[PDB]
Amino acid sequence: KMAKDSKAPVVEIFDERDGCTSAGSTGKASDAGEKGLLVKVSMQKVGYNAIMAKSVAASYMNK
Amino acid sequence: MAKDSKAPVVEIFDERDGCTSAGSTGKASDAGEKGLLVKVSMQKVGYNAIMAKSVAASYMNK
Amino acid sequence: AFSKVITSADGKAAYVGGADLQALKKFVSDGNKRMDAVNAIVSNASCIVSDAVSGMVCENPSLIAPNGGVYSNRKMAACLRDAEIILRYVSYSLLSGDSSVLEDRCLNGLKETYSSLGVPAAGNARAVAIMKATVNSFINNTAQQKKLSVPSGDCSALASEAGGYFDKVTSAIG
Amino acid sequence: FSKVITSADGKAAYVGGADLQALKKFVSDGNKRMDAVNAIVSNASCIVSDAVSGMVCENPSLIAPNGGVYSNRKMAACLRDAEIILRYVSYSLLSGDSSVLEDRCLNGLKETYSSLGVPAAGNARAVAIMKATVNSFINNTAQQKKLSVPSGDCSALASEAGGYFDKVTSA
Ligand SMILES: *CCC1=C(C)C(=O)N/C1=C\c1[nH]c(/C=C2\N=C(C[C@H]3NC(=O)C([C@H](*)C)=C3C)C(C)=C2CCC(=O)O)c(CCC(=O)O)c1C
Ligand SMILES: *CCC1=C(C)C(=O)N/C1=C\c1[nH]c(/C=C2\N=C(C[C@H]3NC(=O)C([C@H](*)C)=C3C)C(C)=C2CCC(=O)O)c(CCC(=O)O)c1C
Ligand SMILES: *[C@@H](C)[C@H]1/C(=C/c2[nH]c(/C=C3N=C(/C=C4\NC(=O)C(CC)=C4C)C(C)=C\3CCC(=O)O)c(CCC(=O)O)c2C)NC(=O)[C@@H]1C
Ligand SMILES: *[C@@H](C)[C@H]1/C(=C/c2[nH]c(/C=C3N=C(/C=C4\NC(=O)C(CC)=C4C)C(C)=C\3CCC(=O)O)c(CCC(=O)O)c2C)NC(=O)[C@@H]1C
Ligand SMILES: *[C@@H](C)[C@H]1/C(=C/c2[nH]c(/C=C3N=C(/C=C4\NC(=O)C(CC)=C4C)C(C)=C\3CCC(=O)O)c(CCC(=O)O)c2C)NC(=O)[C@@H]1C
Ligand SMILES: *[C@@H](C)[C@H]1/C(=C/c2[nH]c(/C=C3N=C(/C=C4\NC(=O)C(CC)=C4C)C(C)=C\3CCC(=O)O)c(CCC(=O)O)c2C)NC(=O)[C@@H]1C
Ligand SMILES: *[C@H](C)[C@H]1/C(=C/c2[nH]c(/C=C3N=C(/C=C4\NC(=O)C(CC)=C4C)C(C)=C\3CCC(=O)O)c(CCC(=O)O)c2C)NC(=O)[C@@H]1C
Ligand SMILES: CCC1=C(C)/C(=C/C2=NC(=C\c3[nH]c(/C=C4\NC(=O)[C@H](C)[C@H]4CC)c(C)c3CCC(=O)O)/C(CCC(=O)O)=C2C)NC1=O
């Protein structure tokens, strides 16, 4: 049966081939043959977003 | 000026509808101001590659 | 590598680069285009979810009235949460090239969960349909405001595949 | 707040209850001011993106090769700065004065930008667009995104926020 923990796979795609470098750009995986490229996946709880909930309630009638 | 790229992050809380979470208690007294809180912290403003790429590709579209 | 972090569900990330990434993109179909298609979803996640739930409500304001599916901030927030959960399981299906995790961890028993809470199926199906349409445009880079810069070519097989994952959600909601 | 502003270490100050009653008592329009601040900060990403995008669409020389925001690196730095500035303006509106904005954000910023070659006209226009967008959000007159608050007149707070942007423009 489905999980009940509100967790979902958060996929992040990294393409830093333009050269712009930050601390996280180095050391998270080997880069051989794929310089500047990385896929990251983690399981994270999807948290409630009060600001967005309030915004939709007030704004939904505007495309 | 500072040189740490940090700015005051102000958050406004209004939970008077009664919807609470773990963070809704214990951070301050609520006497006389149920459901209401101002939070301020200094945080580095980080570079946002997704937004930078989006603006470069999309700026001509209002 | 990804199956392990999904099964542990403990928050630690898997990072795929280098030789592992080269192999991943040869194992899935249309591997480089698939990376771009996934980015088209996840980098727009907040836009996709907000617009879909907003459209669900604008087409049926009874949903926000008392007794409605998203009446009160609490219920609207739970609905925006679910839309993002669903979208993210779809995104992982597109990364991995199959729907097993979506079907097993997200959808199995979901109709009964929603039935017993009175989460309305018509509005739910519509939110999913709007996400499906929005994702299709982003994958094809045909959205009207936000654009993605990628090498020119065709991604219609990937777009169809993403649509099929949304159809599995629709068929789970009933 | 002064303690957390000076420590600048990420520890938060939480103001509720009697402390919040006192905060509001000593500034004008205390409750409306909380709403006006929320109108800025809850829209921060919208405000920054739209302002930098408009700066470029009106002046694409800024994104030509070697231009002010050409390359993702430079665009990202500019979006960062727009948010930094916006957030110091938001804190000025919360606290009722511009001392921290002027001292921690603006003092020496003109020379910093001039020596990096960051264009003054582009900076001015990004600030002007943020000023206009903030004015609409405070007054709840934006076209798409709305804020639900008790009906009334926030003209004074809107003018005060505009004055803080004017301090940025002067710098
Ligand atoms: C984040 C929003 C966005 C940006 C930015 C962008 O460039 N495209 C975006 C979204 C997008 N939306 C659709 C399709 C639909 N959106 C809605 C909801 C809104 N329509 C309303 O009537 C309404 C309340 C007044 C809304 C809120 C709907 C209904 C659709 C159509 C769904 C369908 O059945 O086809 C798309 C896809 C089409 C396109 O490219 O414009 C996109 C990309
Ligand atoms: C997140 C964006 C947003 C939502 C959602 C919403 O409901 N309102 C929003 C933004 C907003 N923008 C303005 C004012 C301006 N924005 C621009 C930039 C765009 N104009 C372009 O020509 C362009 C490139 C093609 C853009 C990007 C500009 C120039 C302005 C006007 C600034 C001025 O000199 O007055 C506002 C305020 C006006 C209004 O209420 O509509 C808002 C709320
Ligand atoms: C219900 C599910 C709604 C929702 C709530 C929600 N709140 C938070 C976080 C915070 N809420 C407060 C408010 C207070 N804390 C107090 O101690 C007091 C009394 C003085 C109040 C009024 C605060 C300060 C936070 C931040 C907590 C922190 O800084 O650590 C969240 C986020 C998760 C959390 O519990 O921290 C959520 C989800 N959100 C919604 O969308 C529903 C409408
Ligand atoms: C330059 C300032 C541009 C920019 C960069 C930026 N990147 C990140 C975060 C990450 N980048 C990667 C990429 C890799 N890590 C690796 O080890 C490899 C080789 C295999 C790559 C390609 C990753 C994984 C991250 C996230 C790290 C994590 O999950 O902890 C950031 C965020 C801050 C940071 O340094 O982590 C930034 C700022 N951003 C921009 O806007 C500029 C265009
Ligand atoms: C549909 C999705 C859109 C489209 C896609 C498209 N992409 C390519 C080529 C490449 N895309 C990448 C991207 C990545 N590879 C990675 O490993 C990562 C990080 C995880 C990313 C973001 C790459 C590397 C290529 C190869 C070429 C290059 O290096 O630039 C194509 C070209 C055809 C192909 O199969 O290679 C296409 C068509 N293009 C569109 O127009 C659609 C809107
Ligand atoms: C311009 C900003 C918009 C506007 C504002 C407006 N607000 C009120 C009344 C109140 N607003 C609050 C909100 C808070 N107080 C807090 O301490 C916090 C948390 C930090 C918040 C979010 C409160 C408590 C009130 C008092 C009324 C109530 O009990 O809800 C008014 C009414 C006049 C007044 O000064 O009270 C107005 C006009 N209204 C608009 O139409 C502008 C778009
Ligand atoms: C965007 C509207 C404009 C733009 C911005 C831009 N700024 C920089 C570099 C810096 N910006 C700052 C500003 C601050 N640092 C702080 O710590 C604070 C307060 C906490 C502020 C206000 C600083 C110090 C720098 C230099 C150091 C750094 O890079 O962070 C750049 C990079 C310039 C370069 O070529 O290296 C850019 C692009 N640029 C534009 O063209 C727009 C008009
Ligand atoms: C990780 C996988 C996972 C999924 C899929 C999941 C779904 C899920 N959605 C729920 C509730 C909910 N889901 C919604 C969603 C909506 N309401 C509407 O009207 C719209 C049609 C829709 C948004 C599009 C709402 C409002 C609730 C709360 C129902 C209530 O309390 O009455 C619940 C009941 C428990 C809870 O409130 O958290 C579950 C288990 N939980 C999980 O852990």
User: Which residues in chain B touch residue D72, judged by CB atoms under 8 angstroms apart?
Assistant: 49, 52-53, 56
- Alpha-carbon gap, residue C119 to C101, rounded angstroms: 23
Asked if D82 contacts D113 with a C-beta cutoff of 8 angstroms, the reply is: no
Cβ proximity of D135 and D162 under 8 Å: yes
Residue C44 DSSP SS3 = coil
Quickly count: other Cβ atoms within 10 Å of residue C121's Cβ: 15
Chains in touch with C (≥3 Cβ pairs < 8 A): A, B
Task: Give ∠ CA D8-D12-D15 in degrees, rounded to 5.
Answer: 130
**DSSP sequence for D27-38:** STTHHHHHHHHH
What does the alpha-carbon distance between residue D34 and residue D72 come to, in Å, rounded to a whole number?
35
In this structure, are residues D55 and D126 in contact, taking their beta carbons and an 8 Å threshold? yes
**Is the CB of D102 within 6 Å of ligand 7?**
no
In this structure, are residues A10 and C5 in contact, taking their beta carbons and an 8 Å threshold? Answer: no
Helix, strand, coil tally for chain D in percent (to 5): 70, 0, 25
Burial class (CB in 10 A: 0-12, 13-18, 19+), A4: exposed
* Domains in chain C: ranges and CATH: 1-170 (1.10.490.20)
Which amino acid would we find at residue C5? Answer: V
CA C20/CA B22 separation, integer angstroms = 40
Token couple for D50: 């739209």
C-alpha dihedral (C129, C154, C150, C31), degrees to nearest 10: 90
Helices (H) and strands (E) in chain D, counts: 9, 1
3-state secondary structure of D171: coil
Place of tokens 């199906």: C125
**Chain A neighbors of C26, CB-CB under 8 A:** none
Question: Which of D1, D21, D23, D31 to mutate for ligand 6's pocket (most ligand atoms within 8 Å of CB)?
Answer: D31
- In terms of DSSP H, where are the helices of chain C? 2-8, 18-27, 31-42, 45-59, 72-96, 100-101, 110-117, 121-140, 156-173
Rounded to whole angstroms, the maximal C-alpha distance in chain C is 55
Side-by-side strand order, sheet with A7-15: A7-15, A37-45, C14-16
Three-class SS state of B26:
coil
C147 close to C141: Cβ distance less than 8 angstroms? yes
| CB burial of residue B19 (10 Å; 0-12, 13-18, 19+) | middle
Residue pointed to by tokens 């110091």: D88
For residue C150, what are its two tokens? 């990628």
Number of Cβ within 10 Å of residue B44's Cβ equals 14
Ligand nearest, relative to CA of residue D114: 7
The helix/strand/coil state of C14 is strand
CB-CB contact of D62 with D68 (8 Å):
yes
Q: Residue C73 and residue A55: Cα distance in Å, rounded? A: 10
- The closest of B40, C144, C52 to D9, measured between CA atoms, is B40
For residue D122, which amino acid is it?
Answer: G
Tokens of D45: 């990403």
CA gap D107, D116 in Å, rounded: 16
Please name the method used to determine this structure.
X-ray
Q: How far apart are CA A19 and CA A8, in angstroms?
A: 31
CA distance C46 to C87: 10
Say if the Cβ atoms of B61 and C148 lie within 8 Å. Answer: no
Cα D51 to the center of its chain, rounded Å: 11
| CA distance linking residue D110 with residue D169, whole number of Å | 10
Q: Given an 8 Å threshold on Cβ–Cβ distance, is B61 in contact with C145?
A: yes
Note whether C130 and C52 are within 8 A (CB).
yes
Mutate to test the pocket of ligand 5, among C22, C25, C32 (most ligand atoms within 8 A of CB): C32
Q: Classify the phi-psi angles of B11: left when phi > 0, otherwise alpha if psi is within -120 to 50, otherwise beta.
A: beta
Phi/psi of residue D47, each to 5°? -60, -50
Residue from C135, C171, C173, C160 nearest C30 by CA: C160
Neighbouring C-alpha atoms within 13 Å toward the C-beta of D87 = 23
The length of chain C is 174
- Do C149 and B53 make contact, defined as CB atoms within 8 angstroms? yes
Label residue D15 exposed, middle or buried (CB < 10 Å: 0-12, 13-18, 19+).
Answer: buried
Q: Given the CA of residue C126, which atom of ligand 1 is nearest to it?
A: 34
Round to whole Å and give the CA distance between D107 and D52: 22
Burial class (CB in 10 A: 0-12, 13-18, 19+), B7: buried
Long-range pairs of C95-103 with CB within 8 A, sequence gap ≥ 24: C95/A11, C95/A39, C95/A41, C95/C2, C95/C28, C95/C34, C95/C38, C96/C2, C96/C28, C97/C27, C97/C28, C97/C29, C97/C34, C97/C161, C99/C164, C99/C165, C99/C168, C101/A9, C101/C6, C102/C165, C102/C168, C102/C169, C103/C168, C103/C172
For C76, the closest chain A residue by CA position comes to A53
φ/ψ of residue A34, rounded to 5? -145, 50
Residue C46, CA atoms < 13 Å, CB-side half-sphere: 13
Residues 6 or more apart in contact with residue B17 via CB below 8 angstroms: B35, C72, C73, C74
Q: What is the DSSP letter of C49?
A: H
The tokens for B7 are 């700015």
Report the C-alpha gap between B55 and C88 in whole angstroms.
Answer: 24
Q: Give the single-character DSSP code of B32.
A: T
Helix (H, G, I), strand (E, B) or coil at B12: strand
Beta carbons of A8 and C54 less than 8 Å apart: no
Give long-range contacts, CB 8 A cutoff, 24+ apart: D132-135: D133/D43, D133/D46, D133/D47, D133/D50, D133/D51, D134/D39, D134/D40, D134/D47, D134/D86, D134/D89, D134/D161, D134/D162, D134/D165, D135/D161, D135/D162
As a whole number of angstroms, the distance between CA D156 and CA C129 comes to: 44
Residue closest to B29 by CA, chosen among D23, D15, C44, D169: D15
Hunting for tokens 């939709």 — which residue is that?
A56
What residues contact D50, with CB distance under 8 A and at least 6 apart? D129, D133
Interchain contact A50–D (C-beta under 8 A): no
The DSSP code sequence of A18-63 is T----GGGSSSS--TTSTTEEEEEEEEE----HHHHHHHHHHTT--
CA B22 to chain centre: 17
Q: Does the CB atom of residue C156 touch ligand 5 within 6 A?
A: no
Tokens of A23: 């601390």
